[PDB]
Amino acid sequence: KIFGAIWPLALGALKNLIK
């Protein structure tokens, strides 16, 4: 609705921690 790169950027930062 009003979120540009919020959903795709979410998992993007996830791997940066677990991986």
Q: How many angstroms separate the CA atoms of 6 and 13, rounded? A: 11
Q: Give the Cα-Cα-Cα angle 11, 6, 4 (nearest 5 degrees).
A: 140
Q: How was this structure determined?
A: NMR
HEC per residue, 1-19: CCCCCCHHHHHHHHHHHHC
Q: How many angstroms separate the CA atoms of 18 and 2, rounded? A: 28
Q: How many angstroms separate the CA atoms of 18 and 8, rounded? A: 17
Q: How many CA atoms lie within 13 A of 5 on its CB side?
A: 4
